[model samples]
Structure formats: C-alpha cells, structure tokens
Target: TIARDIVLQESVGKGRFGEVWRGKWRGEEVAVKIFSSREERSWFREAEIFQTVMLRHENILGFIAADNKDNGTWTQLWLVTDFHEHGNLFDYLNRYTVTVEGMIKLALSTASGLAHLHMEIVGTQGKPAIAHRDLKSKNILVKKNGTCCICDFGLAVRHDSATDTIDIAPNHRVGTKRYMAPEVLDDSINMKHFESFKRADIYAMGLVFWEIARRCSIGGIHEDYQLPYYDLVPSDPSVEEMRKVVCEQKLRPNIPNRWQSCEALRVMAKIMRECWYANGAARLTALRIKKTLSQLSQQEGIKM
Candidate 1:
C-alpha cells in the first residue's frame, strides 16, 4: 500500500538488467528502478535489505515503494526511493572539495550505514545479517548536506549470527575489481579465501577516499573534469590489476607539492596515506578514519 501507481521519468542509470528511471508517486519525487526479467533475484535482495535498514539513519537510502507488473509477455519489477538528484559519490566528488576532512566525514557517514548492516536483525538476533558484497564509490549516494548513504545491496551476502563468516560461490564473480581485496582477486588460485566483507569494504572505501582526494584542490577545486588517475584498462579495472597495483605497485595518489607544503595539506597528506595502505589489514577502520577527520577539524579550528 506504500505506492499506488508509477510513472517513468528520465533515464538516469543503466545496467545489465534495465534502466533506472526517475519517477513520482503521491506528489513526491522518487527513483523507479524497473527490472527487465521476472526471474531476476536482485530486486528481491535489495528490498529485503531496505525493509530492515530503513529509518535507522537519515543518511541511508529509504524505500518508498516496490511493485511488479506484466504487460502481456514482458514482466517488470519496480523499485522506488527518495529522489537523489546528485546521484553517486563519483559524480559528487568531481564537483565538490575532496579533502581529507571531507573524506573522513563521508567515510564515517558511509560506515555508519554499513555498521547498521553488520548488526543483528531489526527485532531478532538470530536471523542472517546483511553484507554488501559490492561496496564502492558508485554505490555510495551523497545527500544535499554532504552526508553519505550506502546503496545497491543486490550482491550483498546474508550471514548467520552463529558465525561472522560469509559464503561465496566458486565461479560467481562479484564486486568491482578495483575495489576487491587481495584475497578476493586471488580466488582463482584459492576458492576458499578468507576475507570479511567489512574488511573488504574498508579497502574499497580507501580507494574511494583516494579517488576523491586525488581530484580535490582543497581550498579550491581543480579545473572542470580534471582527474588524477588516467587511462587504465577500463572504467572498472580487473581484480588482478587492482591487487597488483595495490599490493605490488605501492601506488599512491600524487598530491601536488603545493598542497603538501600548506598547513592544511600537511594534515591531509597523513590521513590520505592511511587510506591507501598497501596491506588491507593495516588500513584504518571506518570509525577510526572518522575520528581522524574530527582531529583535522580541531586543527583547522572550525567552530560549529
């Protein structure tokens, strides 16, 4: 009964399944994600997570409606949520200040949302928990107030309370290659690699933080459409490349010498390094990263 009717809007996103449409219901704006096939289970998983995670945080994505319709032979599923015009974090970072302090806040907000998933079910403690298999910048949605929310639980894993471990299929490839942890990329050699989704997520977040900071100008942003890392293999690189670059290359974003010399950049340089730790185990935790930002705020002496 949450949604009565659906009207398609502009095509804002497209994936293997179908296009994501901006729609309206009950006079409020919403995103209508329609599934092309009836057999697809992605929609079911997304709704299951939202049904439980909604109202936990204002920064998290909320569900407005879910529906299924069939026009003769074509069956479709509809997903509606609060209309976010800013879209993903990738686009937002390009236009906004991707500072260390800002990255910390964004990481905290995102971590808060993820923390909600790492806990027991809403009312019970025995049900399987939610784990976002694919955690990347594109899956993060930015709010108008600069806060962040986690989305896209289609590839999420359901964990039992008895064990803090997750189960993955041998041939089932999931998650973005660039964000995959070292263990994830080596699945070909070892199918039963042990890596917590939380840890994996932290790794991906570090890259996302790096991506944002690399394009930032701190007090002033770089020229329009300016990106630090250029010409990889594809938009989403392979897991092997991700692991090689992160583990073997010892690669880090090129912080302009100008910023490193500045008082503000000096602090940022340190925090950025922690985000790009070569070893995922050594990387900073989400809460810890957030605290880092808090410390930066104190150094900057912002009174608010």
Candidate 2:
C-alpha cells in the first residue's frame, strides 16, 4: 500500500548520503531523501528504524514511504518523511531570534523526542531503546509552531534489554566533530555498553541547547548565532584536531556569565554543564533532562 505517486518539487537540502527534495504525495507535502545506490545500507537502516513498533511520537519525525526507482543508469533510493517548511533548527535559529518561552519550547520538545527515543517500552511488541549517534542542530527540524523534531536516524543504534545486546552497524560514520563527547573524541568510549552511546547523545544535546540559548533575546539584546567552539576550531576540523581540543585540552563551549541574569538561561546553563561531563557515566539521562525542563515550563507558566 505504499505510495508511488510522489512528484518531486524542489531540492531542500543535501547530505553525505544524497539530496533531499520537497515533494507532493497525493496533494500532501512530503520530504523525499534520495540516496545514491552506493548508500544502500544507510537507506535500509534508517527505514528499518522508522518502522520500529510504537516508535511514533509528536517530537519525532514522521516517516511516510520508502521506495526505490530504478533508472537505466543507476538506482535511486528514496526515504520519504513529513515536510516541514521551516526546515532545520540550524537554519531557523540563524534567521531569527527566539523569546524566553520560545527557547524553552525548543529545548523541551527536543528532550521529549530524545526521551521517547531512549525509552524502552515493556510489552510483547515493544520498542527498543534508541540512541541518535548523529544528534545535531541540522538533524533537528523546526515545525511551524516553534517545536522541534529529531530526524535523520541513519546513524542511530538500538539496545535490546531482553538479550542485553547493543545493535550497532559497523559503519565508519561518526557524529559532528564539534559536538563530539570527550570519550568519543578520545576513542575511549565503551562501545559494548549501549548507555555509552546514549551518553554521547546527551553531550551533543548540551551543545545544541547552548546553540539555542545563545539566540534568546532578553531586553532586546541577543548574541549572533555561532556554532559550538567556533573560536577554537576551524570550519571543517579533523578527528585529531578535535581530539586535541576536546579530549586533550578538555575545552567546552563558553557559557557567558550574563546567562545568570535570566532564570530560564540559568537553568539551561546548569543542565548543559551536567550534560557535558567528561565521564560519560556522570551525564544525565534523556528522561531526567525532559523532567527538568518540564518543571521549568511549569515554573515559568509557559503553556506548551
């Protein structure tokens, strides 16, 4: 019952795997991620993750149909998803500043998504815990309502508690270097332990919160959008360079003292610090972060 009536409209984005296009499927807008034939593994893996039992949630990207169209010269793989006009958080943050409530919504929605992804439901047909190995601002989409959706699960891993097994694809792909955790940069992470992967995701989530908070305008003053460690690293840094900066030097994104002026930013700074711990085991879990933010929302009287 998969839809084959998709009509590609225009190119929306591009990644190492392939180009993403905004398309129309039965008059509904859809995101079509077209991968080249060589990236078959990535396409298959992401599609498999999308089909997991009870994986659907408000903060997670909605998967539509996955298909392949064979042309004479090459095969074209397509992974269709919900099309959000606002695009990724990276682009949206750069375009405009956010209010205090806006920042809270974005951060909380992101944590909610990660929490759902990391939670393992107990049932005959249950969802396994998933870790988004490539969590980044660009991988998160911005909805019209200012909420966020965690997308691009091609680099994700799943943990099966029943068998105590970590299901990881032996792929060379890693997350963005600037957001990499200390252990990831040092190559000391215990890959056998699935929690290690989730902790790495928490480290990246800290950087993402920093990115979102930097754009929060208070009293009509806000800092320009800058990537984490923009001053410390080059545009495209190598693993050795990042290792030297993150692992050897043990440097994290600088938190401006002015953040203390606002209660919301203060809470965010504290959470970010806990998330970026060098010892992965010391990091907070996704559910914990979600609960903290939820409490903050209630305290601030912000209705989601």
Candidate 3:
C-alpha cells in the first residue's frame, strides 16, 4: 500500500556520498535516499547489497522501491520502514534512564540484528559473511516500545568465498572515526592483512554501547543531547593524520569527572578497551556482549 502522496520534503540528513530526505509515498511516510552520483559501480553495488543482505534481516532497514529519475541528475531508492516519533537511540537516550536493564535490552536486540547479517546462508554458493564496516549509535533506531533496530547498510561488505578477501585499501578509512577500532585505522587489520570484519564491528559496537550507557546513567534527555565525539574532530586532517589520532594517538570518549563512581562507566571503559584490542581475536563478539548485558539486566532488576 502506498504510504502517502509522493512529495519530497525537506532534506533531513547528508553523508559523504548522498543526501537523505523525509518523504511520503502514496499516503505513507518513507525515507528517500538519493544517491549523489549515477556511477554504475557504486549504485549497482548498493543495489546488489540491498537485495542481498540489507533486505533479508528483520531488524535491518527495509526498502520500498527504487527508481531512476527521468532527469539525468540522480537515482532514488525509496526505503520504507517504521519511523520512530521519539527519534534515534541517541535522541531517545538523551531523555531516558537507559538503566543497566534498558541498555541490555537494546544491546541484545542490536547484536541479534548483526548476528543475522553475519550468518552463513546455505543457498546460492554460500555467500561470504557480511560485515557492517560502519556500525555506530546513530544507525540505531529505537521504537516507542524500546526495541532497537539497526539501519543503514551503506558500508556493508558481503564476503564471497570465491574471493578470499573483501578489498578495501591499505590504511584506507571508512566509518565514524570516533568509534573506529585502531586496527581498522591501521592497515594492521583488513582482508589482505587480516580477515576479521566481525571483530572490527565488535570493537565499534563496544564504543556505541559505552556512549549509550554513559548517557543513560545520568538520567539523560535534557534540553540538548551531548555526545562524546560530537565536537572531537578537526575540520581537515589527512587520512594518515586521522589514523594517527585514532590509533597511536589513543583518543577516546571523554568521561565526565563526575561519573567516576558509576559502575556503568567502569563497564563502558572496559568494553571500549576490548573493542579496541590490538589483536582482533581478543575483542568481544556481539553475542558475548549481548549475553553479558542480559545478565547485567537481570542483576539490576533483583537489586530494585
């Protein structure tokens, strides 16, 4: 069914390659992703990924329709999904007590979503596992009932067994730098040098969990939502420079001095270090983390 009349509304978001818009399609609400370029390679790759990995997961974002505009400017992919009135997990946390219990619930849901994408499919030559190269807090959406779902697979890589590696670049960078695991910044961890995308994702997830839990602890949701990495970047920095900042430089989320006594803060710091493990093997998998969080939740309940 059409969600609403197809009228392009205000541009709501922007990325390096494209702009996201809030739109309506046949009386229903939808988000329209307008690819910035018609370059066949990038557009086709995204379309293939949409059909393959992104659409299959229940918690992954859903796609509605794709159309090549008659005008030669750009192509549009219409993705229809539940729009949360309360906003993203970041926004949601700003005003809620995402207690130990709440954080676990959300983490469990998100980790489960990632697990689905990482699963080995038995059909059609058993595609290589998919890696969410760019997992972050902003990509998480929270429903009114508090369920968390992951969206935005724009940077996902599908591993195909035919080829042993998913090629990126030596020291090449992608994803939010603040949440980047050191290995991802250093060529020390990639398909060529290493083959552990899942580990990389885990590291990123740890940071996201830290940020979310930290916000939750202070009874978040004030007039403005403050995040650790929001103003942490310089306007211009070479890729190597950024890598130095993220890797050897050892930059991290700022912990408010007041939060020193919070067990949640200690837990967050521990997880962040695990995610940033120099050796991918040492990092915590999403499932392991989810389980830890689950136990944490149960414990919190008994204390009340």
Candidate 4:
C-alpha cells in the first residue's frame, strides 16, 4: 500500500481541497494530492473514477493509488500519481516563450488527451465518456517532452450511454469563472444532456488555446501571457460579471491580426473562433479539434 511505502516530500501545491506533495514510492517519484477529512467525498469520488475500467490513457494523469492514513487524531486522504517536474502548463508558459513547433505540440497533445477522455468505448471492459467540467491551464500539467497531460478530475462527470445517464455529484463545485461557458454562466446549459458538458469543455479549450497562442513566438516575437478576458474582467469576477461579458454581450478572447501572418497560428485562430461560439451546439467536438491539429502538425512537419 502507498501508506506503507511512500514518503512525502516537499509541498508542491495547495488548493481548496488540500495540499499536494512531491512524494517517493520505492525510490520512484510521484505526486500526492492529499485531502482533509472535510473533502473526503471529493477524494473518494475522484479516485473511484480513476479506477474505472479502461480509463487509462497517455494524455490522462496516471493513477497510482488512493489511500487514507489516520494518525489517531487526524486522517489524511491521499491520491497518488505520476509527477511531472515541469508543473502546470500555466506556470510553464509564464516562464518561457514557445516556438511554433512547441505551441503545436502542446496544443495537439492536449487535444489528444481530451479526446480520449471524452470518448466511450464499447465492450465488457469499456470506458465511459467522461467530461472534464473544470478544464483550464492550471489543471493541465506540462511534460518534459513539451506535451500536456490533463489532471484534476475532482469535478469530472462520467456518461453511461447504455442507460443514458450522467453521474453528477451533488456538490457546490463550479469551474473557474474565467473559463466558464456562456451557457454555464447564464444557467441555461442542458445538464441532462451529457453532450452539453462536452461542448462547454470545448469553449474552455478555446480559451486555453488562446493562452498558449499568446505565448508562441514567431520570428523572435511573442506576446505576453494573459488570461482570457484579462482586460474585461476583474481579478476575481463574479458570475453576474462573467455572464454580462460572455453571455449577455457575447464577448470572447481576442485573436490578433498578427497571428494571420503564420500558417499554423492562422489555422489555430480559426479553430478557436469555432470553439468559442455563443451557441454551444456550434462548437467543435474534441475529436474534431484533435483531427484538425493533427493535420496542422503534419503540415508543419512537427515530430509528435
């Protein structure tokens, strides 16, 4: 068990759930997201989804183990997984500008991961279609290879097609306000339809692409990193504020004219335009975006 063999190291991150620590399991490095007793349900629910049949994929954060350790007075719930030393994509992008190739690789890999997460396979050991309700730059980890892995499944929901059911937990959880879809902001999303959730994810994906594109350098020139709607919204925007900007006024992150100068950036900008449509029904699916990016990678001769 992880409790018997793992030794916690330095605290790497902290969130509303609890603290995350870099850990060692039998001389191998791992990331441990520890939750307090107050958030035990979140820990257990996420762990349960991670253990689902055929859920493993290259783009998904690998799940190692889940355990609860009690030291008489307190209990620490631990969710262990592979450790990416580069941290999250948000931090990585802030630290360095990415080349065109780097940008394509990061975006393509992220799309691949999300496509896998959104896909549902058929068979006795089939995987259910899962929607990452809280997708954002911070929730994605950057690998040493310049690729990305999707993490933070605490607010994820799984769809069982056979029964036409969605497993949504009864929690006060909501995605980052900055990345919320228009329907989500306006409280008009069809929660009963699982596809609505996936479309919302695509809207968030468009915002993430904008973030990545802003950091892409072409000919030694790159724009500074900025969050979506950085100019329009406050540091901590309320639902009503986001609704006014996104749903009511129908605004989206800007796509600079300079991006049109480069072929790859131009294609990406067009894709982002489709992704941020006011009508969720008009947005591209994860698989469709993955295919478009794959072609862009081939056109640019990007390796993986």
Candidate 5:
C-alpha cells in the first residue's frame, strides 16, 4: 500500500535536496520531495519527528506519508506533503509586489504557525515545543489563499517540557548562513536552554518579515526583493563570512527610512528590530510577535 498508492506525475522543481514532483494519492495532488543520498540524514530525522512530535499546524507543512522503493539495488525515498501551486515565498515576492493588506496576510499567517510551533500544549494531546532551526523565504510556500506556510523540517528541534530536554538531531547540516542569528554566528548560543533556539527562530522571522515588507508597494512603488544581507555577503556565504558580518560587525538587514511614511511597514520594521537584539533572551517570543501583528493588522483596517 505504501509504494503503490501514490503516483508521481510531472517534475515541477529541482532542489539541492533532489526533485520535487507533483504527485497524486487517490485523486488529490500532493508534493513529493525525493531525497538524494547526500541528504539521507535530513529525511531520516524528519521521519523520526513524525513518530515523536505532534506537528499539526495550519501554517506548517502537512505530513501525509513517506515511501521508500527497495529493489535490492538501491533504495529511493519520497516524502509527501500538501501541494501548493504558488511555489515558495522567495520566488513569489520577486514576481509580483503586494499591497499593504496583502503583506499583512502573509505576515500574520506565518506568525500563527510559528506561535503554535513554539508553544507547549498541556495535557494528554500535548504538543511539545518545536523550534525551526532553518527558517527563510525559500522554505516557505505560498498558498492559494495569499498566505505562506512553512516547510522543510530537516533541522527542527523538539523540546520535552517534562524532562527539560531538547531533542537535537544528530546531523552536521547547518542553517542558512544569511539568516544565522548573531549568537549562532558567534557560536555563543546557549544550547542547554531550549529558549535559545526559539529566540534564534525569531531573529530569522524578523529577516523574513523584512523580505515581505520590501515587496509591499507604497505609492505604487516597491523595493526590489532581496534576501537578508544580500549586499553584505556572497550569494552563498561561508560560516566565517556570516560571522564577521553578523557577529563582529553587528550588521542586520537594512530598514529603509521610506518605510516610515507607511504605518504598516513602519511598525513592522520596529518589530523586526526588537527581534534582532544581540541578546537572544531579550528577543520577543513568537506568541508575543503574533499578538503584535494581529493588533497591527486591525489598526491598518486590514480584514483578516
């Protein structure tokens, strides 16, 4: 039933991980990420999460199944999830600029998902707190509803509150260098404390928020979409390069003064600054960030 049910259709995209095919299960379409041998640990760690963690969030990628084909020669693995035709946020932002209301939709939805992931649900059906170690525009998919949902849980960390233990994946895969937090770049992150990981995620989210804000058209003018630290580092920066820029130089993504004229981008820039504090513990929590955005949306008269 595992290998026979789903049908892989056209190959929609190619990633460093492997090929992503628009597949089918029953009559519905799904996205299938075929893992290359180099990323074997990445897929295996995520599979283990399906067993150990409760990961049902509307803003998060939905996990349906994983199938492996073993013909005695070599085994090929396919990871299946919900399909989004809009592709990822990185490409989407580059194509079309968004309005103030459109920008809020994307921002609020992501915060909703992130808030859920960082919170520990109490009682029997409890969800242990999860931290996304590698969060960026590329890993977030744009849904048909004009909102974004996060994906690629390759380096996710789960925290068991009962024992105060952080379940870290035993892999050498590092997060995106451009989005690395100051603490992380400096290699001073408090690994013993789970809160440190959540704070790092908040820092990355701030960078993501900057990306969305740049795409918002004001006076029918929009800043060109650029990744965080696009001007500061190379296309694919090394860890040492990121450390010098983020940790030693203390440089973050620029917040244009033009944003001050628009209340929406203005307030958002302020929130982002709070998220990029040198001290991880001082950064805003995901829950707090969600509430702030929710309030900002209402103030902007944006219909949620």
Candidate 6:
C-alpha cells in the first residue's frame, strides 16, 4: 500500500486543494495530492471519478492510489498519480518556446484527451461520456515527451445515455471566469442536453489552443505567456467582468496575422475560430478537432 512504502520528497505545488508532493514509491516518482480535512468532498469525489471503470487513458492523469492518513491532530487525504517533470502547460509555455513540431504534439494530445473524455463507449464494460467543466491550461500537465495529460477532475460530470442522466458532480465549484465559454458567460448554456456541457468544454479548449499557439516559435519569435483575454479582463475577474468582455463585447482572443504564415498555425487558428462561436451547436466537436489536428500533423510529416 502507498502508506506502507512511500517517501515524501518536495512540495511541488500548493493550490486550493492543498500541497502536492513529489514522492518516491518503490522505484518510481509520483505526485501526491495531500488534501485538508475540510475539502473531503473534493478529495472523495475526485477519487470516485478517477476509479471509474475503463476510464484510464494515456492523455489523462494516471491514478495510482487514494488514502487518508489519520495521525493525532487531523486526517490528511491523499491522491496519487504519475509525476511529470515538465509540470503543467501554463508553466511550460511560460518558461520555453515550442518548436512547430512540439506545438502540434501538445495540441494533438490535448485534443485527443478531450475527445476521449467526451466519447461514450458501449458494451458491458463501457464508460459514460464525461465533460470537463473546468478545462484550462493550468489543469493540463505536460509530460516528458512534449505531449500533455488532462488532470483535475473535480468539476467533471458524467452522462448516462441509458437513463439520459447527467451526473453533475455535487459541488459548488465554478469554472474559471477567464476561460468561461461565451454561452456560459451569458447564462444561455442549455442544461437539458448533455451535449451542452461538452460544447462548453470545447469552447474552453479553443482558448487553451490559442494560448499554446502564441508560444510557438515562428521565425524565432514567440509571444510571452498571457491568459486568454488578458488585455480585455482584469486579473481574478468576476463573472460580470468576463460576461461583458466575452458575451457583450463579442471579443475572442486575438490570432495574429503572422500566424497565417505557417500551415499548422493557420489550421490551428481556424479551429480556434470554430470553437469560439457563441452558438454552442455550431462549434466543432472534440473528435472533429482531434481528427483535424491529426490530419495536419500527418500532412506536415510530424511524428508523435
């Protein structure tokens, strides 16, 4: 068991969930999320989602164990997963500019991960469609191979086609305002159809794509890291602030004319456009985005 054999290394992260430690378990390294007692709901629910049947995938965070240690004062809840040295996309983009090959690699893997989440497989050992309500670069970690894996399933909701039920995670967590979809900002997202959540996720996915695009080194020039709509919205913006800029003003993140110079960047820019549409139904599906990126990668002869 994890409790029996593990060495706590360094605290690599400190978020609302509490401190995340780089731990040594046997021969390999692992990331352990140590949760405070007050956030039991989040810790428990995330474990439930992680342990779902047939939910494991390459582009998603690999769950290893979940346990709670009670020593004298308090109980510390722990969630363990495979550790990545490169850290998350937000940090990766800030520190280093990506080559065209590196850029496509990150983009395609993210799309592939999102596509798998939105897909609902059939059979006795089937998995329900899941929507990542809080999709963003900060929640996606970069692997050693230049690809990324989607993490943080706290806001995820599952859909059961059999009963047509949307198993919205029981929590009060809202999506980050800066990355909120236009429809979500405007309060017009259709809650009846399960597709609504998926579309919303795609919209946020586009914002992340725009973010990754900016850091692509084209002609030895790459823009510094900036959150989506950094110029339009204030830091730690409220929902009203985001709504005005995203819904009322109808402003999407700028795609520089220079991006048109590269075919991969150009196609990515177009995909971002399709994802930012106000009408959720009009946006490209995650699978569609995945295929488009796949074709672009093959056309450019870029290997995974």
Best by TM-score: 4
lDDT per prediction?
0.62, 0.89, 0.63, 0.89, 0.84, 0.88
**Any idea what lDDT model 5 has?**
0.84
Model 3 TM-score?
0.75
Which pairs clash (backbone N, Cα, C closer than 3 Å) in model 1? Answer: none
lDDT for 110 (candidate 4): 89
Q: How accurate is candidate 2 locally (lDDT)?
A: 0.89
Cα lDDT of model 5 by residue, 1-304, tens digit: 2546888888988654557889888989998878756667766777666554566877888878877665332227777889999999999999989999999899888888889888898877778888988899998999998988988777889998889988897433368888989888887887878898899999999999999999999778989889999999999999999888888898898999899988788878988999999888889888988888899888868765
**Cα lDDT for residue 101, candidate 1:** 53
Query: Which runs of model 4 end up more than 4 angstroms from their true locations?
Result: 70-75, 171-173
What is the lDDT, from 0 to 100, of the residue 250 in candidate 5? 87
C-alpha RMSD between model 2 and the true structure: 1.6
The per-candidate count of clashes, in order, stands at: 0, 0, 12, 0, 0, 0
TM-score of each candidate structure, all chains considered together: 0.77, 0.95, 0.75, 0.96, 0.92, 0.95
User: What local lDDT does model 4 show for residue 142?
Assistant: 92
- What TM-score does candidate 5 get on C-alpha atoms? 0.92
Better of 5 and 6 by lDDT: 6
Q: Can you write out model 1's per-residue Cα lDDT over 68-181, one digit (the tens) per residue?
A: 665433326767787788899878876666654565567557766766665555453334455576777788898876778887767776655455455443236577776676
Lowest-sum lDDT 10-residue window in model 6: 68-77
Q: List runs of model 3 lying over 4 Å from the truth.
A: 1-5, 36-41, 53-55, 73-82, 94-97, 124-127, 165-171, 218-246, 249-270, 294-304
Better of 1 and 3 by TM-score: 1
Tens digits of per-residue lDDT for model 3 on 122-151?
675454467777787788878666667777
